[PDB]
Every structure is written in C-alpha cells, then in structure tokens.
Symmetry: D2
Subunit: 266 residues, 4 copies
C-alpha cells in the first residue's frame, strides 16, 4: 500500500550556505561563516574563539577561513554558542574532532547539544545534527577570558531554553567597541500560550527582551544577520544599517505580541 | 617526605543513615528513607514515583521499603529529584539499574547528575556519587502525570542551579491535601557575592524565596526533614510541628541575609 | 557563486518503510517491523523485549503493532540491538521516551548509539539518527533474563565494532526452537585492508564468520530479512526458504573474499 | 539501632601518593607521577601527550611537573589511558578542565570513564572517580600521531574490558627506543570462571598475555611500576631491573594460572 514517509533533510535557503571570505567586524573580530549565517572568529595572542559555526556542512569552510586568518586547528581554543539548533551549532562535533577547541555552554544548551537537537521542545526530531559534549558549563553572567578578551554570558531564554547573548569589548580605530552577539528572539511556529513543554515561555521571552535592550552594545550582531539588519555581502557597508540592541529588542517584542494575538485568534 | 592526602569519604551524621520503616504522609505518599533524609514514595494504580533517594548507600534499603509497600522493582516508574547532590540523588544510578525507573529532571540537574556531582559550583569534587542519565528533561511549570497524580515542577534555583520544588495533590481522611516537596534553601559555605561561577546567585535565591512562599502547600516536606520541622522518628506526631511554606521561606531568607552580612564582614 | 550542498536525507527503498501486521515466528516471538526491516517482539509474562526498531520514523508503527499484540508502553521492558546504525536503531531514543523500555548493549554499540551514528568508522556523518543512552552494558556471552526467556549476547564485530548476535530459545508446536538473530555481515563500500580507523577489520570479520557458523540456530533471522532468505510478505511461507546460520556465514564469507579481491584490484 | 555504613574512601599505600620530580625515560619521554603510579609525559614540538594521570588528587602535581618540563596547560594536547580505574584515570576530568587536552580511548574505556568507574564489572561502585568524556574513539591497532611520534593502540582486555597497551618509538643516545606502556594484567579479587558479567574473561586474558609477549618492546613500562620491576625512586638505576615484555607476560600468566587453581579450590 503506502510506505512510511522518507526522512526529510533539513534544507535551507541557498544564501545560508553561500561561502564568503572573512569580513572584519573589529580589530580582532571577523565574520567567517556564510552570507546568511553568522560564525564569529575572535583572534587573541593566546588562541582563537569561535562563536557559532552555522550548518553541519560548514566545518571545512570555517577551517579554511580560519587558515586564511592565520588560525591553525591547534590555535582554536574555545567554541561558544548562541543556541544549540542545527543552523548555528551544526558543525560543532566535527570542529571538536578536527581542532583543539573546547565548548563552553550553559546547562540547557549543553543538554540540547548532547542530543544533537533531538527531542526539541517545538521541532521534535525534525531538525537534528551530530551531537557534541560541552567541556565547561557556564552560569548566567559568568565570564570566560581568552587572551585578555573577556566574554560575558547573558542568558536570554525563549527561542531555546539555553539561548545566550555573548558580549565582549574589542577595538576599532584605536577605540573600544562593545560587541553584543545577541541570540535569536524568534518563535517560529511555536505554541506560545499554555505550552506543556515550556509553561513559562512567555515570561522568559519578556525577560529576554529586557535583557537584550540593556546589553552593552556599540555593535549588535545576530545569528541570522538579517535580524539585526546586517548584510554580509555589502562589503564596507555590511554593518552600516545594523540595528541597536534596543531596536532589535523592540522589533522582536512587537513581532512576538503580534504572534500572540494571532495564536489566540487561531 | 609528605605524600598527597588520601581521598576523604563523604561522611554524614549517623541519623542521616539510620533506616526507618515506611511512614505514611497521605493516602498514597510515604517517607521511605532514613530518619534524617527524605525519600518519598507516591503509589498509584499505574506505578510508583520516588522523589529523592538520599545517600548512595541507601539503594537496598529503599527497595526493601518499596517491597514492604507492595512496590516491586518493575513497578517503580519514575524518579524525581529536589537537587542533584550526593545526599539526595546518591543512589539514583543504582536504582535505575535495579528497577524499571526513569529519571525526569531539569537541564541543570541533569548535567550535574550526569557528572555525579563533580565540578560542583561550590564543592568542587569534594562530594561525588555514581553518575546517572536523565530520560526526560522538564521545563519550569511542566507537569508529569502518573496514575492521575499530577506532579508540577517549580524551579527554585540557588542551592544548586537546578533546585526544584515538586507539588502534587493527594488525599487524607477523604479530603485533598496539596503536598509541596520544596528543595533546600541553604548556602553551606557558599561565596554568595561576586561568585564567578554563579554571578546571579543572590537574585536567584531571592526569587526562590518568593517561589516557595507562594507554592500550593497544605503540607510542606523538605529533603532534610529538620529544615521544615519534621521529626520522622516521632511517629503519629512526625509532622505535627511542620512549618508552612511561608514560614520555611521566611526563615531561609532571614538566615540568608545573616550570611550575606557575615560574608561582607569576613 | 556556488553554495555548499544541502544536507542529504538518509533515504531507503520503499519496502524498508512498508508497514506490516505482526508476523508470528514462534510461540512468543513476532516480527513487528516493516516488510524489509526486522524488529522482533518477544512477549513474556514479565514484560516484552524488542530486538531492533528499524528506521527512525518507525516508532509509532512499532507501538501500534505492540498494542495489537497486547503490549502497552509500560509493558515494554528491554530493547536489544543488532548494531547501532540508523536503519536498525533509528527509533530507540523515541521508544525510550514513550515506553518503559531500557536499552542493553555492548560498549561499542553504546558509544555509537550515544552519538546517534555520527562519526561512523566508514560513513562519517552521512547516516545519523537521534542519540540514545544505554542503561546496561553487556559483555560477550553475557545473558539477560526476562520472564525466563534467556537472551545470550554473541559479539560478532565487523559490520560495526559492536555488532552482536542475540540467541534465545522459544517454543513452537510444543517443541523448543533455538532462535538466532544474527547481525549483518556486509561491508558496504568499506575500505577493508589497511583501514586506519579499523586496523584489524579483516581478522574481526573472519572471527565473526566462525561465530555465526557455530550459533545455536534452529531458526536464523537477520536485520535485513533478505540476507537470511526470509520474505516477510510471504505469509505462512515467510520463513520457508530461510538459510541456516552455517549457510549465512558461508555466503557472507564468499562475498567478503570477493570484495577483498576487488579492493586489491581497485 | 544500627545505621547504614559510611561511605569508604578509596585509600591507597602512601607511596602511590608520594610526589616525585620528573624522571627521564628517553629523549622525549618522562615519568611525572608519583613514586608508585606511572604518568608518562611525551613532549613533541607540536604539543605534549600524557599517558595516565594516576589518582584523582594528582592533577595539580602533574601540572606542576609539566610546568617544570616547559609544558603549559595549553601545550597538553592529548591524554591516553591504560585503563579507566580510579588510580590511573583519576584526574582526567580535572585535567581536561584545566588544560587543552583531549582524551582518546577505546569504546570500553570511554564507557567506563564516562561513568567515573561506577558499575565496575568486579568492584561495583566501590572505586569511583570524577567522570570524563572521550573526544576520540580508537580501534585496535589504530595510530595517533602527535609531532611525528606515532602512538599505536594494542587492545589487551582482561583487567578491564578496555585495557590497552600503547607503543611508540623515542630515541636515547641517538638510537631508537621502542617503548611499550603495557596495561595491568592482574585480576585482584576477580571471579575468573563463569563470571556472568564477563563470560569470556579467561579467553581474553590468555589472548592478552600473547599480545603483551609480542609487543615491540625495547623498554617496558607499566601503570604500577613494580609490575615491570621499575623503581622510580632509584634515580639513574630506576629502570635497570625492568622486565622485558616477554617476562612480564609470562609472570602474569603464571600468577593467573595460580589464581584459577585457587578459585577452583575455594
Ligand atoms: C525558522 C528559522 C531557523 C530555525 C531556528 O533556528 O529556529 C532553524 C531550525 O531552521 N532559524 C531561526 C532563528 O531565529 O534562528 C528561525 S527565524 C529565520 C531568520 N530569518 C528568516 C525570515 O523569515 N525572514 C523574513 C520573511 C518575511 C519578511 C521579512 C522582513 O524583511 O521584514 C523577513 C527565518
Ligand atoms: C551541608 C548540608 C548538606 C550538603 C548539601 O546538600 O549541600 C551535602 C552535600 O552534605 N545538605 C544540605 C542541604 O540543605 O541539603 C546542607 S544544610 C544541612 C541540613 N541541616 C544541617 C544543620 O546545620 N542544622 C543546625 C545546626 C545548628 C542549629 C540548628 C537549629 O536548630 O536552628 C540547626 C546541615
Ligand atoms: C548499505 C546497507 C544498509 C546500511 C547499513 O546498515 O550499513 C544503512 C546505513 O543504510 N544496511 C546494510 C546491512 O547489512 O545492515 C547494508 S547491506 C543492504 C541489505 N540488502 C541490500 C542489497 O544490496 N541486495 C542485493 C543486490 C543485488 C543482488 C542481490 C542477490 O539477490 O544476490 C541482492 C543492501
Ligand atoms: C588492586 C590493585 C589496584 C586497583 C586496580 O587498578 O584494579 C585499584 C582499583 O586500587 N591496581 C591494580 C592494577 O593491576 O592496576 C591492582 S594490583 C596492585 C599493584 N601491585 C600491588 C601488590 O599486591 N604487590 C605485591 C604483594 C606481595 C608480594 C609481591 C612480590 O614482590 O612478588 C608483590 C597491588
Ligand atoms: Zn589589534
Ligand atoms: Zn533556532
Ligand atoms: Zn537559526
Ligand atoms: Zn487511596
Ligand atoms: Zn545540597
Ligand atoms: Zn542535603
Ligand atoms: Zn506460550
Ligand atoms: Zn549497518
Ligand atoms: Zn542495515
Ligand atoms: Zn630530542
Ligand atoms: Zn585497575
Ligand atoms: Zn591500578
């Protein structure tokens, strides 16, 4: 009669998979992912840090861009994550096998990473990737220091329980630049109200909007560059139109309120 | 010359290890641990639930008390935890091997349980126990239903990041009894202010005092019975002097404020 | 220019995904998977055992067939595996979440299962599935007893390091039937000689042919029924043409020797 | 009445905990553990390798000896293990947190390491330590290359399922020296015959004696130096009386045969 359906691959817009050369954000901070997925390399005298890696198939491209920047596999010391979905943490397991890197994450992100995104609160097993283990668990507001660049974790639960903003201070034209890599604030297809798998979902998003609004934030970056109005293909003007953290949080809250109203009506 | 020190066993007051026969709390709820460590058995037509197990060496005693209650190893379906320290989650791994039980816990408790209490935020590796894996991850306010007894998780971070209160409604003398198993609110030897491993420790405790104060709570129980003024050796009056959740939270907050003042002075 | 390739779903022949009603093998043993993937249910008075589950998307179908047999989710006690590839262990994680079942496996299978088939010795990350944890680790020749049905593990490394044959004795028409569920002995696209990830691959296959040849084996079943000449769609004659364990081992060794010769020539 | 017993710490002879300064074995190989527990540091231009760490409380001493040798925490790249018992893998988790090191191990050792030595086939939970995760799984005969020093794994199951000998070639006085770090071949208090948790124990030991006998072995070292007649406190003559691999294997087999005979008589 009728067989069960074939497994469906997690397919994405081509621009999410379009390689780009490294794009400099500040003196030691570079975008090294694809046109439409952020993966940030921060280079110190004491090794390099990667914040996100994008999709599972991006590992070799990331390593090629690291090499172009002078970062060998032994020089990658630390991987940090915005959240542990397949389009941001996809290549983490492979990167750990191929480099010196260790992963630091909060408990919620660590648990999701260790199950490869399976049993997701909203997606089930629809979007999985190779599992990886965290080497260090961080708490809210904890700092991690690499070569005198201090990264601070700001938990902003909602998009996932373990969603995190990472902040650090780099320099540009001699002057300090407070960089905020704020996680996604979307809720794509989520049941927001009365969700048995996430009962306090709405309260957590509301707190997260407030957290993002208050981040130290001369420059905002986001896992999907379009969410913060970055255009990584625009060269010297890639960041010209970027939102402030305040504007990003307000836009996300307006969208969220509209989604709540539509859910009540549906 | 001088060898490194021998490993130090986690030794406890004898009353924490003193077996007791099952003590009935409500129609389907029993204390089955030791004189000074709580381990609650809730019996349903659809299997039994255990909330905490005490110290690592308590597994056989727990199984003996379960048998006395008519609960065979196959009948134990679920283990819930207040927090994943050795004196409350100690025998979980062994219980999983010897029974049908699966563990449900929040992400923070799951991560700590899976490392057997090692790399504790405050105790380091001083207090470890056999590691165990969680089978289900719960979110704040999520319910788990076993035989029509509905258990609700109320996160109350502080004592550990993953500290949880569990509430359910049983009956006694025909009437509903709202039981609150509230976690520890102590901070034994903790650095409270400016702790790099737990930057928001104070805010989390303060929120947790408020959470405990508001629990549905006709009867309060706690992992250390003395914290809620239970005396499990007092028979028909074991619960007579028990605190309300409001009184427990107020006493814990007063103690916490005193500890903060002493830390500033030290 | 040219984006990175999209992820490729693990797609299989339709017959591997074609549901079938339960097919009785012996008094307490049933095939409950699909036309072309084995999943064996053994029913005891003390709960049920499942040997393999097939593809990830088969979980609900398996539970439906279990219900048809009188096995509720609480009644499934144990899951055993031939090997931890996606087409045999695919739905294990989901089955553990939805039933009482615990997994017993050898260390090699447990490690591969816990990474969801990622970093496979031969397939890399090409064929992954939701990760799961084993609850009990077994050694070669160890027995597991459920309701007086004794299952014996016979390690037969090669297809995977952790490949296992499981044997047990059921009855049929009053008489004992020694059932052998022997794992795959294929090496699909494998580098056999001088493989740096599996240096003793050839010796292990040769030992495994000998192990299979000697199993107690009135009835042979295999994860892919065609490998043992079963036809699960043939009804009362589904097993009529089945190979002996001796014939299965000889055919596998002949094929393996041909593959070695072709590898030397390529 | 009578409380349950207190947990018993894993206590050892003082010499196992007696720190020593680094002792040179060959041009790039040093003993850096204690008088009576081996922990080998191999120094390359491309980072350092540690084979075993001894007891849990040895981590800081190991790091101090690494510093004395010019190896900073970032320079430690790889940890290899003989077997995953507390007196050899004890400080692995802590070393991973404090250095750049990643662990490579076979599946059996990885599973035991990840449960911190709990549920041991012979010791139960009597001898546990902080759990750690392996970063790479190795197969029998696989090589790992660090700075042109090639380490080969030779599985020698028995003492634990995952027991491994590691071999490599260093130099001394200009000439190549084939170093064999062979695991323990003891069976302390083990049930050897008919052990349900290890049915093929005897066959595995017998194969392991043969494996050790045949290792490339100009210099033999063992996790307990006394097993190979090393005296790490004897300075320039520490290795003078060391056994060959052939002599070590023969002595272990003679002892094993005596233990079998005594078990039959008991
Ligand atoms: C579903 C996405 C995907 C998944 C995840 O991570 O959850 C992942 C598992 O696949 N990652 C997401 C995230 O926030 O990280 C979500 S959100 C994504 C970003 N941006 C797209 C978009 O919908 N753009 C749009 C459409 C119409 C008008 C306008 C305008 O210009 O106003 C913009 C969609
Ligand atoms: C250190 C304890 C131990 C550890 C843990 O879990 O962290 C575990 C790892 O060991 N579990 C604790 C917890 O809260 O769960 C802490 S707190 C414990 C309970 N009650 C004791 C107590 O100090 N009593 C006392 C003393 C003087 C006067 C009075 C009075 O009557 O006012 C009372 C101490
Ligand atoms: C690649 C398969 C798949 C993977 C795995 O598990 O490794 C999984 C990850 O996808 N599972 C396999 C296994 O042995 O478990 C391998 S082998 C499969 C069975 N049977 C097919 C077959 O090739 N049949 C054939 C063709 C021509 C003539 C004749 C004849 O009649 O002689 C038969 C192929
Ligand atoms: C129990 C030990 C301990 C445990 C382990 O790892 O399993 C660990 C968990 O604690 N590690 C061991 C191992 O082989 O790795 C075993 S064996 C240890 C070495 N050497 C001692 C010895 O008994 N010596 C002796 C006595 C009398 C005469 C003579 C003579 O000179 O002939 C020698 C004992
Ligand atoms: Zn600079
Ligand atoms: Zn996402
Ligand atoms: Zn995304
Ligand atoms: Zn009742
Ligand atoms: Zn505690
Ligand atoms: Zn306690
Ligand atoms: Zn019958
Ligand atoms: Zn396979
Ligand atoms: Zn297959
Ligand atoms: Zn040299
Ligand atoms: Zn040992
Ligand atoms: Zn030892």
């Amino acid at each position: 009669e009728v067989p069960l359906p074939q497994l469906r691959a997690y397919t994405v817009d081509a621009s999410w998979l379009q390689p780009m050369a490294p794009l400099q954000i500040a003196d030691h901070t570079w975008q090294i992912g694809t046109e439409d997925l952020t993966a940030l390399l921060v280079q110190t005298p004491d090794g390099a840090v990667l914040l996100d890696g994008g999709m599972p198939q991006m590992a070799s491209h990331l390593l090629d861009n690291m090499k172009a920047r002078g970062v060998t596999p032994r020089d990658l010391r630390l991987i940090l994550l915005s959240h542990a979905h397949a389009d941001h943490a996809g290549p983490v397991a492979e990167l750990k096998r191929r480099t010196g890197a260790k992963v630091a994450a909060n408990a919620e992100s660590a648990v999701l990473l260790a199950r490869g995104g399976s049993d997701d609160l909203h997606f089930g097993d629809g979007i999985t990737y190779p599992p990886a283990n965290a080497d260090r668990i961080v708490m809210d507001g904890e700092v991690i220091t690499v070569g005198g660049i201090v990264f601070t974790a700001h938990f902003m639960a909602g998009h996932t329980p373990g969603s995190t903003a990472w902040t650090w201070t780099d320099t540009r034209n001699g002057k300090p630049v407070r960089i905020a890599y704020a996680d996604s604030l979307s809720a794509p297809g989520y049941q927001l109200q009365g969700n048995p798998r996430y009962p306090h979902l709405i309260e957590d998003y509301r707190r997260s909007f407030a957290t993002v609004r208050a981040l130290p934030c001369d420059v905002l970056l986001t896992p999907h560059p379009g969410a913060s109005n970055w255009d990584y293909a625009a060269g010297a003007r890639a960041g010209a139109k970027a939102l402030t953290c305040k504007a990003y949080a307000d836009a996300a809250e307006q969208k969220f309120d509209g989604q709540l109203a539509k859910e009540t009506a549906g």
